[PDB]
């Protein structure tokens with residue numbers, strides 16, 4: 001069976017219980033924690049690409065009030081659906097399964113200014129999603145996996161001083 005497991009789930013869960021925040025910038029910012037997954041049940045002989053995108057979690061935006069995240073108004077129009085291609089793609093099942101797959105280089109931005117960055121709306125909640133795409137497949141079979149431990153709000157600056165502190169402690 002295809003299994004895609006979240007690495008450092010217990011680290012993600014520390015951020016998630018505070019409500020996780022990821023910085024977006026003009027030029028794009030790497031994530032902490034980094035999304036890493038373990039994979040089993042691929043065909044080791046087959047070739048696959050690994051894709052990452054971010055799904056909008058809510059029909060509303062959020063704001064940080066009196067140290068709580070609350071519904072913060074109507075959403076902006078959905079950010080363009082940007083997909084990140086893992087730089088190891090395309091590769092053998094064996095490659096993907098022999099070690100955790102790390103999305104260390106993906107950059108989150110609030111400006112479409114090129115370089116394979118992901119555009120997100122500040123104060124909107126997102127859930128990372130990985131797609132496995134089989135190479136050379138006439139059916140173009142794709143599998144998708146969501147990671148609810150990895151949910152965060154996109155921010156131009158940290159709202160929760162506890163998140164700021166956690167990001168320094170564990171990085």
Ligand SMILES: CC(=O)Nc1ccc(N2CCN(C)CC2)cc1
Pocket residue numbers: 008010011014170
């Ligand atoms: C430093 C590194 O590369 N990885 C790393 C991974 C995991 C953790 N912990 C911390 C919090 N939690 C109790 C468990 C997960 C911390 C660091």
